[PDB]
Each structure stands twice: as C-alpha cells, then as structure tokens.
Amino acid sequence: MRSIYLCRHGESELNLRGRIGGDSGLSARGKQYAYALANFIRSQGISSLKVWTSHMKRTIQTAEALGVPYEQWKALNEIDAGVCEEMTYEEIQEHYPEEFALRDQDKYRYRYPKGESYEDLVQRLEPVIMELERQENVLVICHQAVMRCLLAYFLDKSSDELPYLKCPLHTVLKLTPVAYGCRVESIYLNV
Amino acid sequence: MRSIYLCRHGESELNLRGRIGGDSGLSARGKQYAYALANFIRSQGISSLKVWTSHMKRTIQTAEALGVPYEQWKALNEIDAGVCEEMTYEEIQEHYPEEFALRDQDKYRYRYPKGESYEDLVQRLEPVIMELERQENVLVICHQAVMRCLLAYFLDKSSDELPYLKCPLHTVLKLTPVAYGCRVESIYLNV
Ligand SMILES: Nc1nc2c(ncn2[C@@H]2O[C@H](COP(=O)(O)OP(=O)(O)OP(=O)(O)O)[C@@H](O)[C@H]2O)c(=O)[nH]1
Ligand SMILES: Nc1nc2c(ncn2[C@@H]2O[C@H](COP(=O)(O)OP(=O)(O)OP(=O)(O)O)[C@@H](O)[C@H]2O)c(=O)[nH]1
C-alpha cells in the first residue's frame, strides 16, 4: 500500500530567530532533525521512496541528510509574504497595522502586499497534487502554508479549516490513502 | 479635558527575537522610542502628569527616559504565558500543539499551562481601572495584553473583540473620555 509522508524542513535560522518567509538555512537543531528524519524513514523500510523538496535552502539541506536523490519543485516553495517578508508579527503590527487585521476577516483569500494568499497557493500546488496521485511512496519536505494546503486536499478540509491546520516543525504526517479517504498518523521527532 | 495616554513599553530584546513574555530590557531602538516619547510628552504641555509603569524592566527603562517620577504597579505586569514563557509561536506549535489549537477557540478564556488568561488579567486590572478612572492626566507605559484590556474598558469593547484590538509597539494612544464614551488619538512615534 502506498503512503505520502509530509513534513516541513528542519528548523531554520529565521524560524528560530522569530521571522517569517525568507530563504534561511537550517539551524544547528534543524540539522539534527534532518538526521532524525533520515532515521525515521529508514525505520519505515519503504520500497523505492521518492523525495521531493522545494527550491528553498531549508528543504534542500534537510533532504541532503537523507543520502538519496531528491527532485526540486518551484511550486512547493513557501507562500510569498511580500512586503512583510522576514518580519516578525510585531514588526507587521507596527509597520502594516491595518493589513494585520484585514487578514483576520478572511485568512484564506487574504493577500499580503506584493505576495500570495492561501487561495493562490492552493492553485499553484495543483501540478504537485496531480503528480502526488501518480506516485506510490513520496516524502514531500515542504513548508507550513504549503503543507496545510496539501493536507487540506487529502483530508478534504474546507477553505476555512485550511489556514488553521496543525503543521508544526519536526512533525511528520504519514498519509495512507484508503477506500474511505486517507488515514493519517502524526510522528513527532524530538531534537 | 483629561486624557489617558496608553502606550506599550519600548521594543524589548525579546520582542526583536520572536519571543513572548520574559523580563528583557529595551533594545537600542526601544531606547530611541523612550526618548521620542519624552519629546512628545513635553510638546503636549501637559499639567501634573502621572506616569504609571509595571515592575518589568522594559516599562521602567522607558519611564526613565522621561526624566520624571513614576510609580510601579505589579498589576500592570504583562499576562503570564506560563510554560510558554519566552517561546516563539513556532516553539509553542511544536511543543504544545494541542494548546495552540485550543487557544484559537476562545482567545479570551484561553489560559496558558501554569499561567493566566485575558479573563485572569481583567480581574487583576480591576483596581488599576478604578484609580485610572478617578485620576486626571495619566500616562501608562504597559504591555500588549494589558493595554488591550485597558483600552477595551474605555472603548466599551466586548471580551470577544478584546484580544484583537490594535496595540502595536511605539504607538501612544491618547484616550479622552467624553459623554458618548471615549475619544482616541493614535500617535505613531517612528524610530
Ligand atoms: N499576525 C501574525 N502573523 C504571524 C505571526 N507569526 C507568523 N505570522 C504570519 O501570519 C501569516 C499566517 O500565519 P499562520 O497561519 O500561523 O502561518 P502560515 O499562514 O503558514 O504563514 P507562513 O508563515 O507564510 O507559512 C503568515 O504570513 C505568517 O508568517 C504572529 O504572531 N502574528
Ligand atoms: N502562539 C502564538 N502566540 C503568540 C504569537 N504572538 C504572540 N503570542 C502570544 O500568544 C498570546 C496571545 O497573543 P496576542 O493576542 O497576539 O497577544 P497578548 O495576548 O497581548 O500576549 P502577551 O504578549 O502574553 O500579552 C500571548 O501570550 C502572546 O504573547 C504568535 O504568533 N503565536
């Protein structure tokens, strides 16, 4: 039976430092998770697993720790925050006060100045989902907003539930598509 | 005419780093706001101004720049994050995934493990609201949650919308209560 493993990149510099978006590398702890992930995968004993990542350094560095070939997707790249890229929630409140609240009205269709929205991201992911269906066993090392859209698809969640799906760092969601839908198991790798 | 100048302490080191709670001091930019705030106060030509701060290093440090006396109130201390003290919103999502989700159901009544809620803080702020009410011109250098509770009281906002009120850093809100309720004047101090 096939299964799709979804998880985020290891903790990044910006993650640890309190900032969103950007293209930072893995933190010391992030690298540790990469090795923990490699251990978990090997533990699964999967037949010919294909590893997918985005173009972001964080996803790549995580895959590098798997010692197996990985395919890069520009579509798996994290949502563009635009003007408030690499900013903290406090900086966003200070420099873009009305935008911060505008989001609360509709987090799915909300779009940051010069950036994407969850609705946009869902659309940009269409190609990936298509391929995900054609594959057997796949490990998609991605991002928060991305993992939420992917998860929402397989778990048939509404556009409302989507922006609030649990996609923490160092947690691998193993989806096993079945007749009634798709089973899910949460594996937290503590490092 | 009497005004209640509510403002948050100047940016702290922890604010800049991504973390909630703690007892850190003002960053260099935070200190700059302390000085800007002092300049603003003088320009106001205010009569017998009373400065109130909390016992936190960040509020004291802001008051010092004013060059005027100020009284400290433990009741004005920021809401306790309990076990989540000094964590980032990612660390919370990772180590306390269920807690994070539960909070989203009721931001007002959500209480941190070993900490408090907005409801708890309201009770704690009761005597502050009273003295503040029976006072004249008053400057209160406080924190985010605290400023929200105070503001909601004077603007007669429901507990429902309380946690979402705009309380960005480096912004002083001049509150002048008048017959139909209370008037506000948002003063942004760019530094
Ligand atoms: N308002 C607010 N936004 C935050 C905070 N921390 C991160 N954000 C940003 O708020 C938006 C959505 O928040 P979340 O649903 O928690 O995460 P996300 O949508 O997957 O965002 P990305 O960070 O782009 O993945 C994103 O642009 C986040 O980067 C915070 O404390 N407050
Ligand atoms: N989980 C999470 N908590 C955050 C974030 N930004 C701030 N917090 C903390 O989450 C709680 C509620 O968030 P907010 O309503 O934005 O702010 P607050 O309640 O005034 O927070 P305090 O800073 O504790 O007063 C508080 O304890 C915040 O410190 C974030 O992005 N994620």
Q: Which amino acid is at B9?
A: H
Residue A13: Cβ within 10 Å count:
17
End-to-end CA distance of chain A: 30
* Partner-chain contact B167 A93, CB within 8 Å: yes
Identify whether the C-beta of residue B66 lies closer than 8 Å to the C-beta of residue B154: no
Nearest-neighbour CA in chain B from A134: distance (Å): 31
Identify whether the C-beta of residue A58 lies closer than 8 Å to the C-beta of residue A72: no
Q: Which 8-state DSSP code applies to residue A181?
A: E
Q: How many angstroms separate the CA atoms of B127 and B129, rounded?
A: 5
- CA within 13 Å, CB half, B181: 9
Could you list the residues of A known to form a binding site for ATP, using ranges: 100-103, 144-148, 180
End-to-end CA distance of chain B: 29
Give the residue, out of A89, A116, A146, with the most ligand 1 atoms within 8 A of its beta carbon, to mutate for a pocket test.
A89
Q: Closest-CA residue in chain A for B96?
A: A168
Burial per residue of A98-117, b for 16 or more beta-carbon CB atoms within 10 angstroms, e otherwise:
ebbeebeeeebebbbeebbb
Q: B118: which residues sit within 8 A by CB, 6+ positions away?
A: B79, B107, B108, B109, B110, B145, B148, B149, B159, B162, B163
Question: With contacts defined as CB-CB under 8 Å, which chain B residues touch A90?
Answer: 11, 15, 168-169
Does residue B186 sit at the A interface (CB-CB below 8 Å)?
A: no
The SS3 of residue A114 is coil
* Partner-chain contact B94 A18, CB within 8 Å: no
Does residue A19 sit at the B interface (CB-CB below 8 Å)?
A: yes
What residues form DSSP beta bridges with B96? none
Q: A41: which residues sit within 8 A by CB, 6+ positions away?
A: A5, A49, A66, A139
Q: How many angstroms separate the CA atoms of B132 and B12, rounded?
A: 25
Q: A76: which residues sit within 8 A by CB, 6+ positions away?
A: A52, A53, A54, A55, A59, A125, A128, A140, A142, A143, A146
- Domain edges within chain A: 1-191
Q: How many angstroms separate the CA atoms of A104 and A183, rounded?
A: 31
Q: Which amino acid is at B39?
A: N
Q: Is B146 annotated as a binding residue?
A: yes
Q: Which amino acid is at B15?
A: N
Q: Is B144 exposed, middle or buried (0-12, 13-18, 19+ CB in 10 A)?
A: buried
DSSP string across B77-126: SPPP-GGGTT--HHHHHHH-HHHHHHHTT-TTT---TTS--HHHHHHHHH
Residue B171 parent element (H or E): strand B171-178
Please say whether the dihedral angle defined by the alpha carbons of residues B92, B96, B99 and B104, taken in this order, is positive or negative: positive
Residue B119: Cβ within 10 Å count:
16
User: Would you name the residues of B annotated as active-site residues?
Assistant: 9, 78
CA–centroid distance, residue B167 to ligand 2 (Å): 12
Q: How many angstroms separate the CA atoms of A50 and B34, rounded?
A: 55
Q: Which ligand is nearest to the CA of A104?
A: 1
Q: How many angstroms separate the CA atoms of B164 and B151, rounded?
A: 11
- B137 Rama sector, left if φ>0, alpha if ψ -120 to 50, beta otherwise: beta
Identify whether the C-beta of residue B53 lies closer than 8 Å to the C-beta of residue B59: yes
CA–centroid distance, residue A11 to ligand 1 (Å): 16
- CA within 13 Å, CB half, A32: 9
CATH 3.40.10.10 fits A1-191, yes or no: no
Total number of residues shown for chain A:
191
- Verify whether ligand 1 is closer than 6 Å to residue A26 (CB atom): no
Q: Is B118 annotated as a binding residue?
A: yes
Task: Tell me whether residue A78 is one of the annotated catalytic residues.
Answer: yes
Give the distance between the most distant pair of CA atoms in chain B. Answer: 51
What residues form DSSP beta bridges with B66? none
* Partner-chain contact A90 B170, CB within 8 Å: no
Q: How many angstroms separate the CA atoms of B101 and B40, rounded?
A: 41
Structural biology method used = X-ray
Tell which residue, B60, B99, B18, has the closest CA to residue A92. B18
Q: How many angstroms separate the CA atoms of B127 and A139, rounded?
A: 56
Q: How many angstroms separate the CA atoms of B157 and B10, rounded?
A: 25
Total number of residues shown for chain B:
191
Q: How many angstroms separate the CA atoms of B116 and B84, rounded?
A: 11
The SS3 of residue B51 is strand
- Verify whether ligand 1 is closer than 6 Å to residue A88 (CB atom): no
Does residue B145 sit at the A interface (CB-CB below 8 Å)?
A: no
Q: Which 8-state DSSP code applies to residue A96?
A: S
What residues form DSSP beta bridges with A178? A181
Question: With contacts defined as CB-CB under 8 Å, which chain A residues touch B11?
Answer: 90
Q: Which 8-state DSSP code applies to residue B76?
A: G
Q: Could you tell me the resolution of this structure in angstroms?
A: 2.2
According to DSSP, the β-strands at B171-178 and B50-53 are unpaired
Alpha-helical regions (H) of A76-181: 89-95, 97-105, 118-124, 126-134, 144-154
* Partner-chain contact A164 B101, CB within 8 Å: yes
Tell which residue, A11, A3, A5, has the closest CA to residue A170. A11
* Partner-chain contact B97 A170, CB within 8 Å: no
Ligand 1 atom 2 nearest Cα: A89
* Partner-chain contact A94 B168, CB within 8 Å: yes
Q: Quick one: tokens of A13? A: 């510099």
According to DSSP, the β-strands at A4-8 and A171-178 are antiparallel
Does residue B86 sit at the A interface (CB-CB below 8 Å)?
A: no
Q: Which amino acid is at A81?
A: A
Identify whether the C-beta of residue B132 lies closer than 8 Å to the C-beta of residue B101: no
Residue B190: Cβ within 10 Å count:
10
The SS3 of residue A108 is coil
